[PDB]
Amino acid sequence: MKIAIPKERRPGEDRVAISPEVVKKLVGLGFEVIVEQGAGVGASITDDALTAAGATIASTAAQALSQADVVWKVQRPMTAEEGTDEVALIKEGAVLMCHLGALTNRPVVEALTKRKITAYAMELMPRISRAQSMNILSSQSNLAGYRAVIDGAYEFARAFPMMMTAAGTVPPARVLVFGVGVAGLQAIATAKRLGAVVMATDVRAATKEQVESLGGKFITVDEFRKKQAEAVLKELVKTDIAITTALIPGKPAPVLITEEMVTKMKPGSVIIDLAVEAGGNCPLSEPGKIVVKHGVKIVGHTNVPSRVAADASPLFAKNLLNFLTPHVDKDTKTLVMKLEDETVSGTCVTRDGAIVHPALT
Amino acid sequence: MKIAIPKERRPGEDRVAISPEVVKKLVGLGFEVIVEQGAGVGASITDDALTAAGATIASTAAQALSQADVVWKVQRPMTAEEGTDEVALIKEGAVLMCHLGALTNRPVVEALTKRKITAYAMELMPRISRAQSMNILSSQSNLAGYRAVIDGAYEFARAFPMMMTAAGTVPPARVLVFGVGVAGLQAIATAKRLGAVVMATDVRAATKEQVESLGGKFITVGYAKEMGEEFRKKQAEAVLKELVKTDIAITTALIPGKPAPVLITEEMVTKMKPGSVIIDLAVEAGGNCPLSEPGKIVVKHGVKIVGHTNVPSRVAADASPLFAKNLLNFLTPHVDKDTKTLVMKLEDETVSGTCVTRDGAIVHPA
Amino acid sequence: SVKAGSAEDAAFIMKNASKVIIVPGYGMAVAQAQHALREMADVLKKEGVEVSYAIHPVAGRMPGHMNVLLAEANVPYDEVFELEEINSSFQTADVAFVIGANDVTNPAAKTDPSSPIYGMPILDVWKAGTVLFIKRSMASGYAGVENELFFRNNTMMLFGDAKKMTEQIVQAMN
Ligand SMILES: NC(=O)c1ccc[n+]([C@@H]2O[C@H](COP(=O)([O-])OP(=O)(O)OC[C@H]3O[C@@H](n4cnc5c(N)ncnc54)[C@H](OP(=O)(O)O)[C@@H]3O)[C@@H](O)[C@H]2O)c1
Ligand SMILES: NC(=O)c1ccc[n+]([C@@H]2O[C@H](COP(=O)([O-])OP(=O)(O)OC[C@H]3O[C@@H](n4cnc5c(N)ncnc54)[C@H](O)[C@@H]3O)[C@@H](O)[C@H]2O)c1
């Protein structure tokens, strides 16, 4: 079979759904691997590095996808309604694996269904231990958590660590991480290793132990418990960098720092709002912008995993590889996807010209 | 006596030569402290905070400097030739302490001389152990060393630390520090903090043990001399094995009274990995890399060459209180309280070493 | 069933050994036991014993959880190995020093198909001559299931806090 990987066409997307290591593994499984010219450039992967690994290079996207039985992408393909019909480039009856956003983008799901394309939405990977290696949500959001700290340190006008000098002593930065999922934990780790005093808060109670296991301090209080909002504010007033990561799928992001809260922060402070694409944990944040209000920088970059595209791409490619590998026969050149497999049934949104996933039928 | 601190007016300069802590110290010494309105905005220091510390707030630079016996600034005052004449705002006979750049900027020295202004160039602080507390070069370059890693990490499309994960291992970044002075030591330390593998090289032998005590590895091949072409070939040869594997190259090397030494040639960046970053901290002095350009990020051969000007000002809110304390430590041993006047001992090495002109006559041999 | 041991026991087993593989997990992070751990490796390497670290891809509760703490403790990178690099090295190792790890070593990932961790790769720590688990009690891990290896003949349980126990092991060594 032929597997194809195009360049990502959406603005600002520098990731690619391939790496030289994964090319090597795919050829070993009996695939012909085709990559579009310049697809890995944003991810620091040259055409020469992929040819060396065993891949063929196609000069255009249409040529890459023309005869491909399997297609791997990072973001969902663009539709004719978006002005560039990428789904039409994909061969009829073929298999697509990518981050679809299927539960919030039914038009692309319908457009793939018209071409009888079998689409697997990688974001719908079930939360089971054996599928951890296939989870794109965790691999990408982990780097986003690291990157939040780097972006925060860049926008901050003081150094992170304490420094004892002959000229005098400058204090460490104080960091407050809102939301302690995968992204929040890596932000705690990165802020901490850089020398900052790190606080964290999360609504879940099992989080306290996880925060402490990284040397962070969890915000605690000791009927109507809004002494919690009081305990958070007490720390937020001393905070130099606030990183907010709280995300609810399908829904707007919860408001964790109001404008009233921002006004009480000191000048030179910086908020990194990683929920900005879903409305933001702070109302003042704007997608793709750094806003300055009340002396505070409100940083709202889009596609934060793409700001670490060269480390993000090999992990994304490995997630797909791990998902696809158990279904390659190689006694006949066929990809037989197994229906009783929970990763297959969990991620399949449409196949053979019919919508399959229960949430979209 | 009156001490004044205006806002820095030169493009991109966000530092200020004052802090709330230092205001209080100056008030306790017997000074009246005046700061120009909004001078500490870039350094995150409010007018209210300086007011609470015991300072007066003047509405303009001229009004701040009008009656000031001593003036503290970060960068050298702008002359009429440069645009706004800041030297003319300073009261005649007054004292000026700042990063003057006297050895490379004679027009400003003569302009202060014409107005009988006594000028002390803080960058000409003698290299003695007791003057480390008043050394603006080491205080500012320390933070520049930190900032280089942060700028490196920001421009880099990969993560610094090793992470073993369900989706495979993220390898650690490899950092190479060229020149292990004050800036280089902090670069090593900060890269190490972030989980990078750190290599370093320098021409001074005492540096090797300093690199190793920070967990870096030294590449075998006061201040330095011009090594010549012979050594440059041997240095580049030993460096190249690491440089082809390097993700972030931080270059910090300077030679006093000379252009910065070339440490990474254009031929050498050709051999570097795509997506690599060079941070040229010596760019204002000509650069350790010929492809760097002041105030720009240059992309060539798949490599970002970063050459920000005024790197200390990229950490302005830490740089400012340290710069203000350097000034305080230099001025304090000469304040004659019980007479409330400033008598700068001429016998002092730090006074004679830094004084460029006084009372209408140029003092420093230059 | 459970062969419980002390810091004194662990001290001679690892010092008499010529090769030790350290297996850190979530409990190591909770106790902040990394500095005492690297200290223990140092007194081992000085004794002539070759020491390594086996990192499961999902040890702890985040990606790179063990890495950041081991780096904080100044554990050199050349002693640190991913699951696929080191899983065949347990055979040649005298001791598998498992500190605060559980599910990561649990063989029910290969055996029991009804197990929550079925299909997840694991570290074959039992192939070592002796296995020593440091954990406070007989409680389960994240998966909430029991571990067959606690009752295995070449396993010695070392009950206590991961930092406290490891500190005592450094004291029991000379
Ligand atoms: N890494 C990730 O990204 C990630 C993501 C989500 C979930 N997980 C899951 O979490 C598990 C991680 O594996 P693991 O090896 O760390 O096993 P684990 O299931 O976390 O077991 C940790 C062990 O440490 C012990 N412990 C806790 N506090 C301690 C202390 N202060 N001193 C000594 N021991 C202590 C516990 O036993 P006692 O209470 O008896 O001491 C427990 O058995 C995997 O199942 C993985 O799937 C990981
Ligand atoms: N800041 C000061 O002025 C000051 C004061 C007292 C003592 N010192 C001591 O002297 C040292 C110098 O620090 P610095 O930051 O002032 O140095 P610097 O800013 O003059 O230069 C940085 C480093 O570049 C190195 N270098 C120069 N040419 C080189 C080449 N071709 N190849 C490789 N390396 C080259 C130098 O040896 C120096 O260590 C410090 O470690 C400090 O302990 C410095």
Short mmCIF file of N, CA and C in Angstrom, two decimals, chain A residues 248-310:
data_model
loop_
_atom_site.label_atom_id
_atom_site.label_comp_id
_atom_site.label_asym_id
_atom_site.label_seq_id
_atom_site.Cartn_x
_atom_site.Cartn_y
_atom_site.Cartn_z
N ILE A 248 -12.36 22.47 28.63
CA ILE A 248 -13.51 21.56 28.66
C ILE A 248 -13.95 21.29 27.21
N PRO A 249 -13.81 20.03 26.74
CA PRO A 249 -14.11 19.69 25.34
C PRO A 249 -15.55 19.99 24.91
N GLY A 250 -15.69 20.58 23.72
CA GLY A 250 -17.00 20.96 23.19
C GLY A 250 -17.61 22.22 23.79
N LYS A 251 -17.04 22.70 24.90
CA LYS A 251 -17.63 23.79 25.67
C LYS A 251 -16.65 24.96 25.77
N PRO A 252 -17.15 26.17 26.11
CA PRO A 252 -16.25 27.29 26.37
C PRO A 252 -15.36 27.04 27.58
N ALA A 253 -14.15 27.61 27.55
CA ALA A 253 -13.20 27.44 28.65
C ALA A 253 -13.70 28.18 29.89
N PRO A 254 -13.52 27.58 31.08
CA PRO A 254 -13.97 28.24 32.30
C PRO A 254 -13.15 29.49 32.60
N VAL A 255 -13.81 30.52 33.13
CA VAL A 255 -13.14 31.77 33.48
C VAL A 255 -12.47 31.61 34.84
N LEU A 256 -11.14 31.61 34.84
CA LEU A 256 -10.35 31.44 36.07
C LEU A 256 -9.68 32.74 36.53
N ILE A 257 -9.40 33.65 35.60
CA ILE A 257 -8.91 34.99 35.93
C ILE A 257 -9.79 36.04 35.24
N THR A 258 -10.65 36.68 36.02
CA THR A 258 -11.51 37.76 35.53
C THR A 258 -10.68 39.03 35.34
N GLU A 259 -11.26 40.02 34.66
CA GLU A 259 -10.61 41.33 34.53
C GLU A 259 -10.41 42.01 35.89
N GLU A 260 -11.36 41.81 36.81
CA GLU A 260 -11.23 42.32 38.17
C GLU A 260 -10.00 41.72 38.86
N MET A 261 -9.75 40.44 38.60
CA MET A 261 -8.55 39.78 39.12
C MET A 261 -7.27 40.34 38.48
N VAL A 262 -7.31 40.64 37.18
CA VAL A 262 -6.15 41.18 36.46
C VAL A 262 -5.72 42.53 37.03
N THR A 263 -6.69 43.39 37.32
CA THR A 263 -6.42 44.73 37.87
C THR A 263 -5.63 44.69 39.18
N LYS A 264 -5.80 43.62 39.95
CA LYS A 264 -5.11 43.44 41.22
C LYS A 264 -3.71 42.80 41.10
N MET A 265 -3.27 42.49 39.88
CA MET A 265 -1.92 41.99 39.64
C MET A 265 -0.94 43.15 39.50
N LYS A 266 0.33 42.90 39.79
CA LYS A 266 1.36 43.94 39.72
C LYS A 266 1.81 44.18 38.27
N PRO A 267 2.29 45.40 37.96
CA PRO A 267 2.81 45.69 36.62
C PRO A 267 4.00 44.81 36.25
N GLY A 268 4.11 44.49 34.96
CA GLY A 268 5.15 43.60 34.47
C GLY A 268 4.76 42.13 34.53
N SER A 269 3.60 41.83 35.12
CA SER A 269 3.09 40.47 35.16
C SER A 269 2.62 40.03 33.78
N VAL A 270 2.55 38.72 33.59
CA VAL A 270 2.25 38.13 32.30
C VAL A 270 1.32 36.93 32.55
N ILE A 271 0.22 36.89 31.80
CA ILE A 271 -0.68 35.74 31.81
C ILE A 271 -0.51 35.00 30.48
N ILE A 272 -0.23 33.69 30.54
CA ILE A 272 -0.27 32.83 29.35
C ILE A 272 -1.56 32.03 29.40
N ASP A 273 -2.46 32.34 28.46
CA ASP A 273 -3.77 31.71 28.40
C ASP A 273 -3.75 30.62 27.33
N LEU A 274 -3.52 29.38 27.76
CA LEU A 274 -3.51 28.23 26.86
C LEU A 274 -4.91 27.76 26.44
N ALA A 275 -5.96 28.37 27.01
CA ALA A 275 -7.34 28.05 26.65
C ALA A 275 -7.94 29.08 25.68
N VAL A 276 -7.09 29.94 25.11
CA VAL A 276 -7.53 31.08 24.29
C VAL A 276 -8.34 30.70 23.03
N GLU A 277 -8.08 29.52 22.46
CA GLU A 277 -8.84 29.05 21.29
C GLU A 277 -10.27 28.61 21.64
N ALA A 278 -10.50 28.28 22.91
CA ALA A 278 -11.84 27.91 23.41
C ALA A 278 -12.48 29.02 24.26
N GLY A 279 -12.12 30.27 24.00
CA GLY A 279 -12.67 31.42 24.72
C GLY A 279 -11.76 32.00 25.80
N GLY A 280 -10.81 31.20 26.28
CA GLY A 280 -9.83 31.66 27.26
C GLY A 280 -10.28 31.50 28.70
N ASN A 281 -9.32 31.23 29.58
CA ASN A 281 -9.56 31.28 31.02
C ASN A 281 -9.55 32.72 31.53
N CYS A 282 -9.05 33.63 30.69
CA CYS A 282 -9.12 35.06 30.94
C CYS A 282 -9.86 35.74 29.78
N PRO A 283 -10.92 36.52 30.08
CA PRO A 283 -11.66 37.27 29.05
C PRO A 283 -10.84 38.26 28.22
N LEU A 284 -9.78 38.81 28.81
CA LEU A 284 -8.94 39.79 28.12
C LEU A 284 -8.06 39.20 27.01
N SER A 285 -7.88 37.88 27.01
CA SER A 285 -7.04 37.25 25.99
C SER A 285 -7.70 37.29 24.61
N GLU A 286 -6.87 37.42 23.57
CA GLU A 286 -7.31 37.42 22.18
C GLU A 286 -6.44 36.45 21.38
N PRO A 287 -7.07 35.55 20.59
CA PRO A 287 -6.34 34.56 19.79
C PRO A 287 -5.23 35.14 18.91
N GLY A 288 -4.02 34.63 19.08
CA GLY A 288 -2.88 35.05 18.27
C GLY A 288 -2.31 36.41 18.62
N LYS A 289 -2.68 36.94 19.79
CA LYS A 289 -2.24 38.27 20.19
C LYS A 289 -1.66 38.30 21.60
N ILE A 290 -0.78 39.27 21.82
CA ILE A 290 -0.40 39.69 23.16
C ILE A 290 -1.10 41.02 23.44
N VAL A 291 -2.04 41.00 24.38
CA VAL A 291 -2.78 42.18 24.80
C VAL A 291 -2.15 42.73 26.07
N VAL A 292 -2.07 44.05 26.18
CA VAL A 292 -1.58 44.71 27.39
C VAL A 292 -2.70 45.51 28.02
N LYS A 293 -3.12 45.12 29.23
CA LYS A 293 -4.12 45.87 29.98
C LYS A 293 -3.85 45.84 31.49
N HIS A 294 -4.02 46.99 32.12
CA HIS A 294 -3.76 47.20 33.56
C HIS A 294 -2.31 46.90 33.96
N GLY A 295 -1.37 47.15 33.04
CA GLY A 295 0.04 46.84 33.25
C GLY A 295 0.45 45.39 33.02
N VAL A 296 -0.53 44.52 32.75
CA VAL A 296 -0.32 43.08 32.64
C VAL A 296 -0.30 42.66 31.17
N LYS A 297 0.63 41.78 30.79
CA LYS A 297 0.65 41.20 29.45
C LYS A 297 -0.24 39.96 29.41
N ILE A 298 -1.22 39.95 28.51
CA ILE A 298 -2.11 38.80 28.36
C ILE A 298 -1.75 38.11 27.05
N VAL A 299 -1.01 37.01 27.15
CA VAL A 299 -0.46 36.31 26.00
C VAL A 299 -1.41 35.19 25.57
N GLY A 300 -1.81 35.20 24.30
CA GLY A 300 -2.81 34.25 23.79
C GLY A 300 -2.44 33.65 22.44
N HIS A 301 -1.27 33.03 22.37
CA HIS A 301 -0.83 32.36 21.15
C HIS A 301 -1.77 31.21 20.77
N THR A 302 -1.97 31.03 19.47
CA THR A 302 -2.72 29.89 18.95
C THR A 302 -1.75 28.76 18.65
N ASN A 303 -2.28 27.54 18.59
CA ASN A 303 -1.52 26.37 18.15
C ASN A 303 -0.16 26.29 18.83
N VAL A 304 -0.19 26.19 20.16
CA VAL A 304 1.04 26.22 20.95
C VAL A 304 1.94 24.99 20.67
N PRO A 305 1.36 23.79 20.46
CA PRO A 305 2.19 22.66 20.01
C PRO A 305 3.01 22.92 18.74
N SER A 306 2.49 23.73 17.82
CA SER A 306 3.22 24.10 16.61
C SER A 306 4.39 25.06 16.90
N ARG A 307 4.39 25.72 18.06
CA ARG A 307 5.56 26.49 18.52
C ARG A 307 6.70 25.59 19.01
N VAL A 308 6.45 24.28 19.10
CA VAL A 308 7.49 23.27 19.33
C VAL A 308 7.39 22.21 18.23
N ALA A 309 7.23 22.65 16.99
CA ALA A 309 6.86 21.76 15.88
C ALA A 309 7.87 20.65 15.58
N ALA A 310 9.16 20.91 15.81
CA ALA A 310 10.21 19.96 15.49
C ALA A 310 10.33 18.81 16.51
#
